[PDB]
Amino acid sequence: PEALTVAATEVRRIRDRAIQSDAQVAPMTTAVRPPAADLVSEKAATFLVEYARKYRQTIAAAAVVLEEFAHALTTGA
């Protein structure tokens, strides 16, 4: 069944595109500066930076899942 290997290639492409888009916006999402010098501005900017980072981690885990799945298609064929 060649079709399973085909799928595995597609799933790997999907992984490549997720991490690509993620890495593409990381420099903006993780670089959020506080609008002003007050505590509210700073806390908001900090939260957003941490939120962007936990998202980057979440996608990396999804990339792992995608790759494990594509591997289940190849070695499982």
């Binding site: 799933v11 007050d38 509210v40 939120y51 962007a52 998202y55 899942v65 799945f69």
Partner: protein, 173 residues
């Protein structure tokens, strides 16, 4: 207690930084991120569906079925991505109001200048009412700045409360 800080500090602090441009760039970025992940979701459903049929087999289905949790997770991630941009815009709008509503430093300084000038010439008690007038205006600037800053804290805090933790994906067995 931004009401602990005096108007000179609260006003200066809100006029200090670089403005919201950094937050707005991040907003656009989260949006393009929601878009890509929409397209990713659809191409993953494509790989599972449209590009499957040709080949049938019990193993093909066992995998196609074990992937269900993840496709559902993907949908939930997409919903959560579409909210970030919105909450960022609320943060920024609130900041804009704080910045716009703070008492300008010049008005605080002109108030202290004039009060001191009256004091200088009040050996005869002629200006005691007007000094009381300038003192109340100053205290009012202190309360106003404090209130602006309280309302900014409240709005930003609400916005942030809508940003729910990123949940981990399940495995594809």
């Amino acid at each position: 207690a931004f009401e602990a800080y005096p108007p000179e500090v609260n006003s200066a602090n809100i006029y200090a930084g670089p403005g919201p441009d950094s937050m707005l760039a991040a907003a656009r970025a989260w949006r393009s991120l929601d878009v890509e992940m929409t397209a990713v979701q659809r191409s993953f459903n494509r790989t599972l569906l449209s590009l499957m049929d040709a080949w049938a087999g019990p193993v093909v289905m066992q995998l196609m079925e074990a992937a269900k949790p993840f496709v559902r997770w993907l949908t939930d991630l997409c919903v959560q991505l579409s909210e970030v941009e919105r909450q960022i815009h609320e943060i920024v709008r609130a900041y804009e109001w704080a910045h716009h509503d703070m008492v300008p430093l010049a008005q605080i300084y002109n108030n202290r200048a004039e009060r001191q000038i009256l004091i200088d010439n009040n050996a005869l008690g002629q200006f005691t009412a007007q000094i009381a007038d300038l003192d109340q205006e100053y205290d009012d600037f202190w309360d106003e700045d404090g209130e602006v800053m309280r309302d900014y804290r409240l709005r930003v805090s609400d916005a942030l409360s809508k940003l729910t933790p990123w949940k981990a994906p399940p495995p594809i067995a």
